[PDB]
Each structure stands twice: as C-alpha cells, then as structure tokens.
Amino acid sequence: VLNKWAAVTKSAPPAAGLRPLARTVSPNPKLRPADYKVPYVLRTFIKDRHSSEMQHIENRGMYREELAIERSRFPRMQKTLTIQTDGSLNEREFEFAVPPVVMLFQDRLSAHRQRQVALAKIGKLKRVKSWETSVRGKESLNPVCNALVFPYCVPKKMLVRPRIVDPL
Amino acid sequence: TFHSQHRTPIIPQVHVHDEPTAQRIHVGYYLHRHPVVKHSPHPLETEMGYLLEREQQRYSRHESAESATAFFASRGQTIDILGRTDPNQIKGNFFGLELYQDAMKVVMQRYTPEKRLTSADLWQPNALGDAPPPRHTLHRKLDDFLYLIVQEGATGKWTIPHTARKDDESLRMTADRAISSQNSEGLDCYVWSNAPQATVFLKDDNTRLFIYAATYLAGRPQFASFEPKPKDHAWVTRHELLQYSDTFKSAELLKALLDISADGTFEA
Amino acid sequence: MNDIYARRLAQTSMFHQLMRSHGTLWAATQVTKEKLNLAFVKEEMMRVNGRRAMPLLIGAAANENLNDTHFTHLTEHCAWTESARAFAVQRQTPLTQHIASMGRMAETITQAKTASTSQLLFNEHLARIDGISEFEEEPF
Amino acid sequence: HFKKVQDTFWSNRKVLVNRIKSMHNQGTLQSAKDLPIKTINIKAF
Amino acid sequence: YYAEVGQAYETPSHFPLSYTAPFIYQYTAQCWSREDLQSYLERIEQSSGLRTIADAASRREALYTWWHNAGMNVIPLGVLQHLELVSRDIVAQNARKSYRIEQHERGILRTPEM
Amino acid sequence: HLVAREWINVPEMKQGELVERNMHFWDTIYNVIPELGLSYPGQKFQWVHSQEFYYLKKIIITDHNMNLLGVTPMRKMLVWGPFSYYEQRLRRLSALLHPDDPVLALEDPNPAMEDKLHIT
Amino acid sequence: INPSYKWLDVEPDIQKVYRSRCMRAALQARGKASMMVAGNVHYRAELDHVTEPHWRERVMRVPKATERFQDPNYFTRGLVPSLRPLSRYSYE
Amino acid sequence: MPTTVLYHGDQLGPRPLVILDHSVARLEQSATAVLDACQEAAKRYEAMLSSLAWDHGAVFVPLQVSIGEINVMEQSCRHVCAVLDAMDVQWSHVLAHSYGALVAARMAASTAYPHRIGSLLLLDTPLVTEQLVRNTKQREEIAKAKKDVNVPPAELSFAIESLRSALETTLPYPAAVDKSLYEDHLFSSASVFREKGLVRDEHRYVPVRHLAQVHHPLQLLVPVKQPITDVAIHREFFGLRRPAVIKTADNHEDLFSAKCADEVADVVRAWMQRFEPDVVMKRRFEKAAKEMVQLMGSSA
Amino acid sequence: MLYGGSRVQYLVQPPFTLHKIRSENLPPPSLYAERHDLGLEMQLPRDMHVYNSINMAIQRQVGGDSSTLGGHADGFDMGAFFTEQHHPERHHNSSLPYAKHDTNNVLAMRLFPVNVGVRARTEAIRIRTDDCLQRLRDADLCAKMRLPLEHPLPLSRRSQYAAIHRVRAAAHPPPSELSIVTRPVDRLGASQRWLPLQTLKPMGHNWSAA
Amino acid sequence: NEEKWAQAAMEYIHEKNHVNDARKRQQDVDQERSIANAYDRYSAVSEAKFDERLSRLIARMSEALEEMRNLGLEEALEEAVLLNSEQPPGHYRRPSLTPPLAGYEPGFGLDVPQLRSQQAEYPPLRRPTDWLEFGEGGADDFPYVDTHKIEDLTAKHEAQLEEQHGVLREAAPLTGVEGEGWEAYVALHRKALARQHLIMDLHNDPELRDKYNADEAFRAAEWERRGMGALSIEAPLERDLELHYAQVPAYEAFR
Amino acid sequence: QRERDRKARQIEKLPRPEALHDFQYPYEKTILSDSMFEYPVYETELDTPQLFNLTPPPDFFIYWNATDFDRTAYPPVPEDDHRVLVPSSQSPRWIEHRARLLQYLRKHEIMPHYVPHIHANVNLSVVFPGQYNTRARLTDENGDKIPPPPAQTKMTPRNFWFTAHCGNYMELTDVQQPPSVFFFEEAPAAASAASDAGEAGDAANKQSSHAAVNYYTFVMLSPDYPYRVPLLQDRHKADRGFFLNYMVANL
Amino acid sequence: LDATGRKLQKTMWDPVLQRYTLMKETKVRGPFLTKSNIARKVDFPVGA
C-alpha cells in the first residue's frame, strides 16, 4: 500500500461501493470447497446481466405484489379438444405444437369394452359373486397384517385369503 | 387419477365362520350416478380463467417460444417423429398417418357436440306445485349427482332399497347381493367401501340399517322386482331431496342420507 | 379454467375416495387412539394427492418411492387428469419426464430422442389420463 | 465462460460413457453405485 | 475481579452472605470501609429473602427487585453487582472443588498444582 | 444521484407557434434504464441497480403532490431533525472542502471548443 | 478437542490482566489462591468437564443432512434468524 | 319469501334469468295489492323479454322494504337467495333497474352469497357517483390524516372543509318509488355518516372498497341520449370495458319501448350467450372446426 | 395442496410478519462511531510513533474492525480466505480500493481536475489543504477570542497579541459583529487586490520513478 | 447429431427465475390482485360447505363402525374395516365438457389400427411394496405379510426418506408455497411412517399398550417423542387490510 | 486387486458430468428472505430513534418535493400511550413501561451515572405547549406575532411527541414555552390494603399530599451545557453541575 | 489456451480518469498513445 510519504503516490482508488467483488469459487481445485461440483447446468445463455445474476438467487418465498401462481415451471400449455371414443368431448392441454381437435382412439371405455369382450372369449365376462362365493378358503394366524395399507397398516390376528385371479 | 389396477391385488370379502347370532339388521344401498358433464362454470370463474391463462402464459417457462416445437425449431432440432420444424404443418398433419387425416376430415364436417342441457331440465311450473314430480329420467341433469329414493307400495313413504342380513354374510356381501338379486344381476353396481356409510336405529321395527353408497354404471333398475314392494322410484339430486321430506319415511334417515350424499356442487 | 374444473372434480372424489378409506383409517386410529376427524383425514388426504415433483435431474428426485403404494393409488383423487399443470406439479411435464432421464443418464440420448417425440408423448400421455397402460406383472 | 462449460459437458460426457463401456468391457463388473454418477444404468447402454 | 484472579474462596456455598464480605472488600476499599460492608451485607440478609451464597447466585433477579423497591437509598448497587460477581464464583469454584474431590475417589489423583 | 421529475414542461413549436407540451419524462428514464421494468423480488436491494449505469443509485423524483399522507419512509429521505448526537457532521466535513472546489456544472450553450462541455 | 491446533488470542485490555496477575501472583504468594483456575495449564483438561460434562458428544455428534440445512421456508417465515449451511464444524 | 313471481316463458330451465326491479312494496299489507304493484313493473319487462326468447325461462322476484334499520339489505339477499333455492338454481344471470340492483351488488360483493349471482346487468342504475367516490377516497386519507400527527393542520383543515363543502349526494334514484328508500334508509344523510363528512357508515348498503371488488362480469346498459349513470366513472371502477349503448333509446324508461325492446335484448342475449356453457361450447368447437380446416386448406 | 397442485385459492400471498427492533437494546450514542461512519479522506495512520499503527500485511482485512471482537472460534477454512483474500480479481490491478491507508487527501483527490498530472496534483491538493488548515485555525483562533472571523488573519493579529493564551470555552460574537465580509482588507474599509491561492497548470510531470 | 438434440433438449428443462412483466402496471397488477381475492371470497363458501360435509360424512362412518362393534359383529368389523382394493372399473367414467353422443364410434367408423395401439407408460412404477412380493423371499400371502417384515420395511424408509430428504434439501432447495408444500408432503410421510413405527412398538410390546391408553397427556407426550404432531394450516387473513409500510414488496414498485 | 483398485482409482479419475437442476445451493445460488431485506421497525419509537439511527430509503425512486421541508417528521403516535397510565405496582402495561423506561435511561448514559438511584415510581409526562412548528416566526398571512400557546390542559395524541419521554426529540421552537407537568402517582395508599385504617387517611388532612412524599418538586436541568460532551470524557475529568432550566415546587 | 479468438477485454479502474473503463489487450511492447489512438471528432448530443 502506498502512503503519503512515498516517492510516488497514486490518485483516488475506487470506493468499493461500485463494481463490487463477487464472492465466487476460485478456479483453483484446491481453493474450491468440497461439496462444490462443476456446474453443468445447461441453460440458454441469458445476455443482460440484470436477468443473468437473478438466477443465482432463490426468491420464491419473498413477498410479491402479484399473485403467487407457480411460475416458470409449467412450460406453456396449448389446449386442444380431445373427442373421446364415445364422443364425450373433454379438453386438455399440451406443451408442444398440438393441433386443434384431436380424434381419439383407444379410450378408457374402449379398453374396458375390449377387456370384457376378450373376457367374453373365456366367457368369464358376467361376474364373480361374493354371496355366491361360498368358497371359504381362509386361515387365521397370529403375527400377520395387511400389506396394501402399509402406511396405515395394523397388526393383529388376521384371517388370510387369496386374491382374485383375472385372466387378461 | 382413478388409475387402473396396476398390480394391486383384490382381497375379497368372505363368509364369516362364527355365527354371532345375527339380529335385526337391514342393508340398503344408496345408488347414485356419476356426473355426466363438468361443473357448470360460474361466470366469475370464467373471469378467473382469463386471469390464470394470462398469467400462466406470460410467465411461461420459455416466454417467447410459442411451444416446444417452436422452441426446438429455433435450433433446427426437432421433437416430432418425422422431423418437421415449421409447427404450422405439424398442426395440419400431426400424426404421420394419412388415414388419420381421412378420419378427421369426416368428423370436422359431421360432428356436432351434444347439448349439455337436457330438455328434461326445462322444468315447467304449469305441471304443478304439488308433491315432487315423477322424475324418472336418468338423463335428467348431467352436472349434478342423481340419487335413488324409492317409495314402497306399502305405506307410500320413500326408502332406499334395503334387505336383511343373513347369518354368515358380511355387510359388503349383503349389500352386493342386495342389488344384484333385486335386479336379477341386471345392474353394474360399484360399492365404494367394504363397510357401511351410515347407520340408523329404528324404534318401529327396532331395525338397524346400514347404508351403502354405490354408483350406477349400467343396468335397468327393474323396480317391481325390488324387495320393498316399491311404488315408483326417483332419481333426485342431493338438493331436491329436501322436497320429499314431507312424504319421506324417517326424519332420522333423511338427514342421515343428505350427510353421506355427495354433490357435484358443494354450494349447499 | 381447467384447474377450476379439476378442483371442483376432486371434491366429488375426495368425497368418495374417503368413503373407501375411512375404514382403514378407523382401524389405525383405534390403536394410536388419535382423533379421526377432519383434522386427521385432511392431513392424510394431502400426503397422498399433493406430491411436489422435484426437478427430476437429482436422481433422488426421480426416485420418489412413497406415492405409489397400494394405498396411495386408492385414496388418490383424479386431480392430475383435468389439467396438465396440476400434472406438472405431481409429476413433471410429459416431455421433461423423458429429457431428465437422459439428463441423469438413466436412458441414452438415442433412447430419449426417438421415444420422446411429440407423437409418442401424446398417445402415451393420454394413457395415464385414462389409466390404460402397460404393466410389468413381475417388476425387475 | 458459458460456452466453454456447456460444450465440455458433452465431451466430458462422451469421455465417461465411452470409457465406462470399455471399463465394463474389461470384465470390471461395475454396478450402478461404485461409479461417479449413480443414476446411470449401464444395461441401458 | 473474581473469576479471572482465581482466589481460593474456601466458603462453601451454603454459608450466609455475611461471609463473602472479606472477598468483596479487597476490590472495593477506597469505596466503603470494611465495617461498612458488614452493614450492607447484613441488611441484604435481613430484608431480602436471600441468605446464602448459593441463593444470591440463583436469585439475582429476585434480589435486585428487592434492592430496587426496598434498598436504593443505603446499599449502593455497586455492592450488589459485586455481591453477584462473587456469589457466581464461590458457587462456581465449589462446583470445581466438589468435582475435584469426587474424581479423586474415582482415581484421577492430581497434585495440589493439579 | 439523478434528480428528475415525472412531467417536464418542454416548449415546442406547433403551427410555427410556441406551445407548451407536458413531457412525460417517466418514459425517458425507463428507456434509459430497462432494468426498472424487469422487477424481481430482490432488485430494490440489488447492488448495482442498472449494470449499464452502475453510477446510478437513486433517482430523486421531485413532483409536487397534493395528497395529505406523503410518501412512506420506504421512498422518502428524512430531511428533518438532528441527524446526529454529538456534532452535526456537516460542519466537520464543512471544514475539509475548500472555497475553490466545484459546486456547480452549468451546461454550455456555445462551447469555446470541443472540450468545454460544461463549466464548473 | 485436539491440543495440536492452537489459536492466538490478543485480549485488548492490558490493565485487565496486569491488575489480576499482580493479584493472582500476590495471592498465591500468601498461599491463598486456588490452583483450579481456568488459566492453569494442567487443569484445562478437567476444567471443561466440570461445566460441560458431555462436550465430547457435542462435537462427536454427526448431524443429519436434514438439520444441517434447516427448512429454507423457516428462513422466509423468519423462524430461524439466518441459515448458515457451511458452518457445520464445532471448533471448540 | 314470496310466492308471487312472474315466470315469463313457459319453462324455467336450470338457471334462468332472475330479473329484479325496485323494492316493490312492503308486505306489511297483503300479498294481493303488492302483486298488482309488481304486475306493472313486469309491463316494462313483459315487452323486452318477449324479443329475447330465452331458452331457460325468465323470473321476476319482488323485494320488501324493512320494518327496521339494517333489515333492508340482508333481508332482500336471503330473500332472493331463497327464491333461488325454491327453484333449484344457483348462478342465475340477473337484470336490474333500481334497488333491485344494489341487492345484486350487495350479494355479489359480500361473502356468504357470491355464488348466487352469476352475471349482473345494469339497466340505468348508477352504483357509484363521482361525488361519492372522489369523496370516499379522501375519507380514507383523512382517516389517516386525522390520526397521524406530522400533518400540518392548515392542509388538514382545508381537506376537511373541501370534503363537506363538496359532500356526497344520494345515489340518483332510477325510478319514483324507492325515492323514499334511496333517501330514507340507504342514504339517510343524517345517519349514514357521523362526524359529518368524515366517516360514513357504509355497512348498510356496501363499503365502497367492496364495490372495488365485484368482478362478477358486469355490464351497464345506457340510452345514447342524456342518461343517468354517466359512463365515464363506471368504466374506471368496474374495469375497462365499454358499456354497450342502446343507440336508439333516448333516456331511461325508453329502453322498454318498442324502439329498443329488440336490441336491449339483442345485446343482453349476447351477454347470456357469454356464460351459458352450451353456447360458448358451440362457438368453441365450431371455432376449432374453422381452425382445423385452415390446416387442410394449406396441405397443398 | 390436497388438490393435486392446482393452485387456485388464496393465490394472493399474505404479507410476511415484521421483525421489530427494540430501540432501547441499542448501543449508546457513540462519538467515535459518529465520526467514522461517514467515510472520508482518512484518519491519521493511528500512529505518530509507528508502534500500534497496523501492519501492511493485514491492511486489506480491516475497515470497521477498530471495534474489539467468525461464525465460530476460527479455522479460516482456507476458503473465502484465500478465495476472497486473493481473488482471481484484485490481482494484476494497480489501484486496490480505499482500504484504511492514509494516502493523499482522497476527499480532495475526488474534487480535483484530472487534467493536472500526478506529481503536480499531490503538490496541489496539499496547497488546497494547507489553506483549509489555515481557515480552520483562524476560526478556532478568532472564535475562541470572541472575535468575528478573519482570514488570512495577519501575523500581528495571529499570535493573538502573544497568542493571548485563550484567556486561560469558545463564544460567538454578538450578531452585531457578524457580517459576510471577512478579509481584513475588506473588514475595516490595505490594497483590496485579489489573487487565487494556487496556480493549477495542466502540465504533466516528466519524472516517473520507474 | 444426437448430442446436438440433447443439447437443445436439456435447454428445455431449465427453469429460470425470470422477471416480472415489464407491461404490468399498478393499475392492473392490483386488478388481478382484486380478482383473486374476489375468488377465494367466492370459493370459500364452496369450500366451507365441503369440509363441513366431511365433518358429517366422517361422523356417519365412525358411528357406523362403532355400532357394528356393539351389535356383536366383531369379526364382521375385521372384514369390513378391510381396505376395499377393487379400483373403480374402466366402465367408471370421468365427466367431460359435453355428454356422450348417441351412438358414436371413433371417427364414425374411420378406424386407425395404429393410434388404437397398446403402448407404454413412463416411468416404470416401482413401489415400496415391490421389495416384498416381486422380490426375493417371495411372500406367498403377499397382502398379508408377516408383521416383522413391516417393522423392517418401515424401518427401511425412515432410513431412506431421511436420506432422500437430506439431498433434496441441499441439492434441490425451494421456498415459498411450493416449499411449504414440499415440507408438508415430506413431514406428512415422516409422520405417517412414524405412526407405523408406533403401532408396531405399540403392538409387539405388551407393556406399553396399557399405560399408553391409560391417559391423554402421555400420548400427547409420546406422540411428541415420535415426531408426530398436528399440522396447522395457515389461516387465510383474506380480509381487506392495509399492510404496514415496511411489508411492501422487496422490489421496485410497478408503474 | 492391484489393477482393479487402480481401475477403481480410474473411476475416480473418470470425469463426473452430472447436469444439475440449477446452481449448487450454498456456493452459487443463494436464498433471500424477508428478514434480510426489511426496513427497521422499532417496536416502540419513544426515543425517537428514526431521527438518529438513519437508514437509507431502500427504494430506487426517492420522492422528495420542496413542501416536505415544512412537515415535522415526528414518529407516528403509539396507541396505549404511556402518559395516561397510572403507576400502580400490578398494572401489566406499567411493569412493561417501568423497565422500558429504565431500559432507555441506561442506553443514554443517564441511569447509572448522572442519576444513580432512580426510584421509578410515578408516571411523569411533561407536556409542552406545542404547535408542530418548523421554526420560530410570526404568523405568515396575519402579519402578527404568534400568540404563545396556552398551558397544556389535557394529554392527547397531538401532545404526545411534545412530552418528556425516554430520550425523544423536540424542536426547540416548541419548548420555548414553560412546560405543563402531568404526573400521576399511585404509591400512597391508606395501608398495605388501604384497610384497617378505620377512617385513617381521612384523618390525614392533606390527602392529595397527606404522605411525606406527595408534595412533588419538578426540577429540570440539562447536563450538556454548552454542548453535548461524551460521557467518557466528562464523566471523569470535570466536576460541574447542570444547567438548571426550571424548578416548580409544592406540586 | 486459445479459448478467446477475440482480443481480451476487461473493465479496470483507469487511474488517470479515476473511472472504470475498458481495457483492450495489446502487446506489452509499444507506444501506448499513437496517432492510431486518435478518435474521430464527433458532435455530442449536447450543446446547441
């Protein structure tokens, strides 16, 4: 540092309040921290640094005069009419270039109307009946409990019974 | 979503094996029809549509790019199968299958969408201001739910088709045959739970009814074949069920029916 | 106004999808002795339907293994069939579901580009919107 | 600064999978965990 | 004044307050005669509900509030914050002594100079 | 600092005759600073408000206003009261500057030569 | 923790220590000073343990990556005064 | 709840038009003479509705004034929202000409009844007046300026006198009958504001800040000639939409003539055909029809 | 949220809760914190005798650290220290920002024409300051004597009649004594001729030490 | 030719914190603020009238399961409380904008054999129970696993979600509504797995089950040691209020 | 073993190209919050701290007219004004106001040094006759000397910021008139419960001042004559009294 | 390494001007103010 008494002294150094020093990772692989992984965030280069450095903050919690719509996540959704196989007209949206009204095959009902007539091949279309299921295959054991309710399961002395088998 | 059964097994219900001395117990099923069309849009909500669809647009993930193709086009890298960049002609022949184009040009000249308002719902006051009108059309109103209330040929009051519980059956099995028998297996019903939906203790017959919510899918509800010797049925909404309150069987049961009754509206 | 359709089509299902679910909750709230009321079922109903999808590039984000139990497919309502934005919350958008796997290398670029086209992402998407989809009966 | 770090990932990736295809080829049974980025499933390659 | 020096306050923490006066003084002569403190360090014991060195370390709030609403004319609060500085030391050291004796049984065995 | 108004009475000649046109100076700033429109929830505490003109830190708007409740302390500089305790820190800094250093820069109508763009 | 890693403390007040040393060394001359002082070199091993008896566990405890990055929403809701994610190591 | 209604069409549909008018009378008297009272009001609408063949039927509800103080507004809403329950209808478009307007603007504003009013068309009724709004925005600033103490009382005193010396008129009454009510209860100038000019108890009709909330799609009908309800102010409050004008009518009460009965309906029917779902749907698919074919025309 | 991500109700964010300050908790009004909060040319080097000053090898990591004392005891992490200490920037510069160094009058390095070369500026910000020192001494000398201000305050008047010894506070003169006119030649009413304090030549030094 | 498609594709994934609109003005950005509040003012009574109905639906179902227990149908409970796994069949319809057409076939009989295909679904759904059936030690009575395979399966996720939620708090942080929407969804799982971890500890231990059910402040203490709590939804102060001048946005105000 | 572990060490020599969601959280991204960026909101503005602890107007556009010179930027009035409280020993507000006042005195060098043993007992409020004047003057329009405002008769919001509070500021123009002294005391009571006196206290013939402490004397004296000197300078190196402004007795 | 075909540029305190200005790279040997570093005259947008 040059003081007042130096053989040569310099003019005004810059007050640091303008053009500040960004505290960013040193390129030296020893002077970067541990958790730091090379930032391969692939992104469309935003030119003006007003909109560039903005990415480097996370201000989804800060108060907003606007309404808190979940933004910059839902890409851009083009509505188009989808005429279901039974003509029931829905309306849904997609992000890419979808045309207007899209004719639809292979709907929900058509699949069910497919499984039935295919189950009509084996003739089992009609139904399996509970009260008529005098089939009483079971067993009761002590340390057993349902598994389909895993988050809210309960253990007790539970009767065991086989599932239904549907050929399809 | 109401996903398909991915791999979830179906654990059936089973005849019980220890006779618990079954008592006075009936099992009724509160049949209703899924909404056929969507909630009639309140004009405020349409004024909310021009809000979100504006904001959800001007804050798109990629603002200027008109779509995914319109974005992907700007690099010359396509997404579609056939490799078309100009997204106007991807809209003309979306699928690379020209038979589909045939399957369209017929529709866009012949198709005319159906009318949401059923003329069964152009109700006329000259019919009468009397006890509720005969409302038999299951095509009545496609916005709301349509519940089944049935009056017996016994005392005229209204009831839910209800039958007693045999000894070794559960309460889903009873409710399962409770409809299939009274329709000769001529209905496609769907009981949601494996346990009742409501409960009403009677003092007249001491009887304990277990309501069950089931959804009509298909099948003509042959009524004179029902158990409670019915006079005529009624497919009424959760709302006008208050209209039968005068002729209705049990004030203990009416509100115990409105309280499990769904609605496509929830403005009540 | 696809959401204001979805929202008003979840309440009529969270009504039913609770009717089938109150039992299994009643069994559990009998031994924990917690109170089974609106203040309990709502907490349940949120952990099954609402699932903010994480950016799909973390690996652990794509590995969410809790909202596809045999249960969470039963009490889950139909929210993400009525609007794709409700779908881009729970899962990611039908294309970003693909590109991200190629991003985290779970599928080669060639596996993405061909199978991530505007057409397949259409007929495939409208399978989940219907629930008519291929399974793997013996998952490996 | 940007353009140099976006392109490298594409050469830095092709260095990985090419060399790991070989480092699988050499008989080195390389599960999905021991290697740097776990989410890859080599059987997809 | 009391902790950084590390005097051997041999006063167990249950003595009356009047037996922390010989320590407080050695830092406050030129302010109050020694026999004057024994007029302040007794009115504290008489008027307030505090009696012991352990008390004046556990009731520094209850003590001051007494002084504010009862003392304030005689006892200079200089004494109090001095009285609080020793009572938080005599109590401290007795914890360091009582521990030093309780390891010496468990077999740690360190000399006078530790 | 940039002390400027929203409306500036700028003369202009209509049909060869002078007439006053209330100029909307606000549109002059935003063209100069496209940063103010692009507002994100952190920008009022941003370091450099406009990376073009990093010199610019505040824009003192001076427009006579008739509402009773003036602008809230978020957007008004406190200009009343004893701003210090021990010494009005102006008379201290008023010791260091000299009676011969600038206080004004009046623009020049006709400059002596290309250098003298303003007179100090 | 480890007697190999040392800091250099400069405490600004020279009178604050001189006017105690001149006592601490005048008391211990009359045999009236206690040797359990914090500043004693050979006592520091035991001194910490009289006051904080489980300080081993307070530095040995390994923190789960959940609590080390406390819910960022607790920072916007203001519950936690300011999140410090890198200050994780107990230097005591 | 009254039994007296004039249903115009033969049908009643799911969600018909619920037309309101002035507060007909008070049912303190029997329902028979007040029936005649609302029977003449329909004779202004019996004409307009005929041209507007409304596929949902059309209603007319009578409103009573209150025996008391606050029961003027809360009654009429619950009174209206009941006749929507006795008909099995929610979201009914409403017309309005008089005090039958404020009630809609009292329901569509406040909670607990925002789903009964779907639309709201104003025939000639002003909801706010320039004098009433340019004053209330000061009645909010003076409210602070009366409180805060930095303010100089030379400006405060000047701002208060300029607030009473330019006080608010009652809402101009678009009829003759409630000219009582518009000057009796709703805007009793000796009661609606205590501390004269400074605080106005607008909880009886509606606080103006809430008239800055009603986003129920709102429309104003206006005679081209000298109107009541200046358009300049209303566009400021209720969003920048131009109120369609009745280019033939001279003043109010001439909307209902034969000169306009078609277009005062042929612009109202355009309003009902903005929210009826089957209408907007047919213009929707038939849009995409004419949209798609543009892609089949460009295929060559 | 129970609806599957369809954010449609309560979209408007509720404004956050305010975190108040207890103004009584604050430190007392501090004079030494009143002076150096502003930011000026410089203080003295903190040394007449070089002891106690500060070392040049740590003159970079200061600025408000005159007050006695990281997030922890310390380990300095070798990061943000050796990552901020010698940034990629701050090297191969020539003018590091104004840190704590008693270099030339930077308060007057800003106010001066850049036209003049350096060695002729640092010799002219002093002749400016040399006058600002006389203006300050005269005000101290004139006020303490209750005299209305005078400058240059000639040498017979200076040494205020043997530097009167300040009769042995300071007081204004009564407003009868005040007036704008302050030069002694203009006060009484010598030659009133006027000349500037220094000659500014836009010439550049022709000896560069390197 | 491929890595150039991906280079343009992984551009499509990037979510950037982008500015407010430059065309927004304090004259409309409050109008849209006036609309949204005019909506939750509208939808409230449509939601208040919903959760009030589940206050009734639940009342009927609880009091119908507890009646089945007094009517002596004990074993009927343990088969009626069982989870009804049969999903509403494909026959079950989801409503659309317009009703079904009277006899409509896809494209009126213009049938495409391709677009009617049976095709994939992404991703492959693997669930926390596939480590039980379709894994080794093939459980013959799958939906009736032994309890000890649940005391371990649940103990796997609390050792997995606590690790999934470790990285997803540093590697993918996010704040605001989506944040408190992610923590809630997480904390609801660390709670749901906790009551599972609780019933087992309440099951295999025959001591605690009595003193647990003995009083209230114990469970409300024991539940506080299990991490299970009572999630408090933020109360909507939608009331028209004048926000304090310091709570104004943290950006330059609109135009 | 040797070359596999080498290959295992080649895996660590292999690059790790791993696209990230966004920037790494601690090092490049950062989390903003409302706590970081918030205007200082003093919970109570008695000491009038805005005028001293200045903070820059954070915003970019700073609206400063010329008319904002007249306005006397006093703080907003705080409701539950201390001046009307009564100094009972059980009043919850008072206890809060008792310490907060003694909090402010320690902050301003007063309590332990100038006034050593303050027995804060009574709720003193020295209202000044105030006009919110920006400077001493004459009436502008009327061409008249401003009539000296009368002795304050009642405490009020307008007379809030012209009281004597915990260190607040008052423009000297307002204090130019003698101050009105409102003080309320509670400490005198007939007994520890005002009971068993049996009409005693009535036998005290000075009820308003019946006790040996109830005739009060209000002395005002300014320690900073002629200019505010630092405590740590004047506390030790000089012994001079105070500039006695005012002293009423037998209040 | 030739990451930059462009001639380097930076913003640095120009100690003469006391202003942050551009710094275009250039060989270190050579006169730094030649008759090529003259800027063509221009009338500013100021003045009459």
PDB file of N, CA, C and O in Angstrom, chain A residues 15-16 22 41 57 60 64 79 86 93 103 130 134 141 164-165:
ATOM      1  N   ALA A  15     -13.698   3.700  -4.549  1.00  0.00           N
ATOM      2  CA  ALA A  15     -14.544   3.271  -3.448  1.00  0.00           C
ATOM      3  C   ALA A  15     -15.304   2.019  -3.860  1.00  0.00           C
ATOM      4  O   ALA A  15     -15.890   1.964  -4.941  1.00  0.00           O
ATOM      5  N   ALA A  16     -15.289   1.007  -2.997  1.00  0.00           N
ATOM      6  CA  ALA A  16     -15.789  -0.304  -3.392  1.00  0.00           C
ATOM      7  C   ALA A  16     -17.298  -0.361  -3.554  1.00  0.00           C
ATOM      8  O   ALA A  16     -17.816  -1.406  -3.956  1.00  0.00           O
ATOM      9  N   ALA A  22     -17.616 -10.022  -6.662  1.00  0.00           N
ATOM     10  CA  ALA A  22     -18.432 -11.201  -6.436  1.00  0.00           C
ATOM     11  C   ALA A  22     -17.630 -12.263  -5.702  1.00  0.00           C
ATOM     12  O   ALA A  22     -16.509 -12.592  -6.090  1.00  0.00           O
ATOM     13  N   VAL A  41     -25.046 -26.896 -15.382  1.00  0.00           N
ATOM     14  CA  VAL A  41     -26.433 -26.502 -15.577  1.00  0.00           C
ATOM     15  C   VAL A  41     -26.555 -26.017 -17.019  1.00  0.00           C
ATOM     16  O   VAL A  41     -26.088 -24.935 -17.370  1.00  0.00           O
ATOM     17  N   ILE A  57     -30.233 -16.322  -7.330  1.00  0.00           N
ATOM     18  CA  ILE A  57     -30.940 -16.182  -6.069  1.00  0.00           C
ATOM     19  C   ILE A  57     -32.198 -17.024  -6.143  1.00  0.00           C
ATOM     20  O   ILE A  57     -32.644 -17.437  -7.214  1.00  0.00           O
ATOM     21  N   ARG A  60     -38.433 -17.411  -4.250  1.00  0.00           N
ATOM     22  CA  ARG A  60     -39.813 -17.852  -4.338  1.00  0.00           C
ATOM     23  C   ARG A  60     -40.559 -17.664  -3.029  1.00  0.00           C
ATOM     24  O   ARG A  60     -41.781 -17.839  -2.998  1.00  0.00           O
ATOM     25  N   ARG A  64     -44.671 -10.873  -2.875  1.00  0.00           N
ATOM     26  CA  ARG A  64     -44.905 -10.437  -4.243  1.00  0.00           C
ATOM     27  C   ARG A  64     -46.225  -9.690  -4.336  1.00  0.00           C
ATOM     28  O   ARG A  64     -47.247 -10.160  -3.835  1.00  0.00           O
ATOM     29  N   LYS A  79     -54.145 -25.742 -25.098  1.00  0.00           N
ATOM     30  CA  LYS A  79     -55.370 -26.519 -25.025  1.00  0.00           C
ATOM     31  C   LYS A  79     -55.783 -27.006 -26.407  1.00  0.00           C
ATOM     32  O   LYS A  79     -55.617 -26.311 -27.412  1.00  0.00           O
ATOM     33  N   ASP A  86     -66.350 -42.315 -27.212  1.00  0.00           N
ATOM     34  CA  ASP A  86     -67.800 -42.219 -27.163  1.00  0.00           C
ATOM     35  C   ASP A  86     -68.295 -40.805 -27.396  1.00  0.00           C
ATOM     36  O   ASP A  86     -69.420 -40.479 -27.009  1.00  0.00           O
ATOM     37  N   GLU A  93     -54.579 -29.966 -22.393  1.00  0.00           N
ATOM     38  CA  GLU A  93     -53.554 -29.041 -22.836  1.00  0.00           C
ATOM     39  C   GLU A  93     -52.198 -29.722 -22.882  1.00  0.00           C
ATOM     40  O   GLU A  93     -51.874 -30.556 -22.035  1.00  0.00           O
ATOM     41  N   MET A 103     -58.868 -36.296 -32.929  1.00  0.00           N
ATOM     42  CA  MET A 103     -59.666 -37.508 -32.850  1.00  0.00           C
ATOM     43  C   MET A 103     -58.939 -38.531 -32.002  1.00  0.00           C
ATOM     44  O   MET A 103     -57.714 -38.646 -32.065  1.00  0.00           O
ATOM     45  N   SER A 130     -69.924 -62.467  -4.611  1.00  0.00           N
ATOM     46  CA  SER A 130     -69.441 -62.681  -3.250  1.00  0.00           C
ATOM     47  C   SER A 130     -70.376 -63.581  -2.457  1.00  0.00           C
ATOM     48  O   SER A 130     -69.953 -64.616  -1.931  1.00  0.00           O
ATOM     49  N   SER A 134     -69.595 -68.948  -1.789  1.00  0.00           N
ATOM     50  CA  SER A 134     -69.480 -69.774  -0.600  1.00  0.00           C
ATOM     51  C   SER A 134     -68.111 -70.428  -0.514  1.00  0.00           C
ATOM     52  O   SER A 134     -67.840 -71.143   0.458  1.00  0.00           O
ATOM     53  N   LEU A 141     -53.920 -66.643  11.525  1.00  0.00           N
ATOM     54  CA  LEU A 141     -52.644 -66.772  12.208  1.00  0.00           C
ATOM     55  C   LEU A 141     -52.396 -65.532  13.057  1.00  0.00           C
ATOM     56  O   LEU A 141     -53.031 -64.493  12.873  1.00  0.00           O
ATOM     57  N   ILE A 164     -58.273 -62.306  -5.982  1.00  0.00           N
ATOM     58  CA  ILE A 164     -58.994 -62.760  -7.161  1.00  0.00           C
ATOM     59  C   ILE A 164     -58.033 -62.829  -8.337  1.00  0.00           C
ATOM     60  O   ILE A 164     -57.141 -61.983  -8.482  1.00  0.00           O
ATOM     61  N   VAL A 165     -58.210 -63.833  -9.187  1.00  0.00           N
ATOM     62  CA  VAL A 165     -57.380 -64.019 -10.370  1.00  0.00           C
ATOM     63  C   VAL A 165     -58.211 -63.663 -11.594  1.00  0.00           C
ATOM     64  O   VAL A 165     -59.288 -64.233 -11.810  1.00  0.00           O
TER      65      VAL A 165
END
